[PDB]
Design a protein around this ligand. Structure first.
Ligand SMILES: CC(=O)/N=c1\sc(S(N)(=O)=O)nn1C
Ligand SMILES: [Zn+2]
Length: 260
């Protein structure tokens, strides 16, 4: 239980349950969003993101992916509105991609898989005292997912792509400062929401998902750069981060609410 899970045949998503029984839970993520079955909730408020760029701290290779971490000792960068009554503190953003540029997202819409997906995660600092605590509670986290569709290159990604040079292998880290992740969100913030979980181990069912209706672009060459990062530690044989997406999971009676 100290660790070893992956995205390969051997320790991949279809095997995770032998180690983490919650993989077969009732609130697993991601899911397929059937637009004809969502329900308009008039109580939903517009989402309000207020991030401080000086809160950007570092970028690190974690082997299965890379994370962009933020200082979360204060409420300098918060997520408000939507379905929530309390403020959520920003802590990180990361991406998910596939082995092909066409299909790599986690969530799907009407049975359609996007190229990639951006996740902006927050934790309930109004209720818990640390991310470690919140991480396992039902109302513990809030993640904004933004679907990515291959086409024209997205210049808003450049600073992230540039930083990838310094964290080529697992365990490498570098300072990553003065950046506001809201610059990556689509122009409209109409969304879908549903209760779910972390999409990789530990798979806790502690996330309130916010999926933006509108997608963002990325070219195939930008994606190729994600796919060029290595999962091995410095000095060993090269093993590229080919994919890190989980298949969609049974909805099991949950409701996907729409803000429109
Ligand atoms: C604590 C935490 O943020 N964990 C993560 S965030 C995450 S995700 N992909 O955003 O659902 N998956 N996991 C394992
Ligand atoms: Zn994620």
């Amino acid at each position: 239980a100290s660790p070893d899970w992956g995205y390969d045949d051997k320790n991949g998503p279809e095997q995770w349950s032998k180690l983490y029984p919650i993989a077969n839970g009732n609130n697993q993520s991601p899911v397929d969003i059937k637009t004809s079955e969502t329900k308009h909730d008039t109580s939903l408020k517009p989402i309000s993101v207020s991030y401080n760029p000086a809160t950007a701290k570092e970028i690190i290779n974690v082997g299965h992916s890379f994370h962009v971490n933020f200082e979360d000792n204060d409420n300098r960068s918060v997520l408000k509105g939507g379905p929530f009554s309390d403020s959520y503190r920003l802590f990180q953003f990361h991406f998910h991609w596939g082995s092909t540029n066409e299909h790599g997202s986690e969530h799907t819409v009407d049975g359609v898989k996007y190229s990639a997906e951006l996740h902006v995660a927050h934790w309930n600092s109004a209720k818990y005292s640390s991310l470690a605590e919140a991480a396992s509670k039902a109302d513990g986290l809030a993640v904004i997912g933004v679907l990515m569709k291959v086409g024209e290159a997205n210049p808003k990604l450049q600073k992230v792509l540039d930083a990838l040079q310094a964290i080529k292998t697992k365990g490498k880290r570098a300072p990553f400062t003065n950046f506001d992740p809201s610059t990556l969100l689509p122009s409209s913030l109409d969304f879908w929401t549903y209760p779910g979980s972390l999409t990789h181990p530990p798979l806790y069912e502690s996330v309130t998902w916010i999926i933006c209706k509108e997608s963002i672009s990325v070219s195939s060459e930008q994606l190729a750069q994600f796919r060029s990062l290595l999962s091995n530690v410095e000095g060993d044989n090269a093993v590229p981060m080919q994919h890190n997406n989980r298949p969609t999971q049974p909805l099991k009676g949950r409701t996907v609410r729409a803000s429109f």
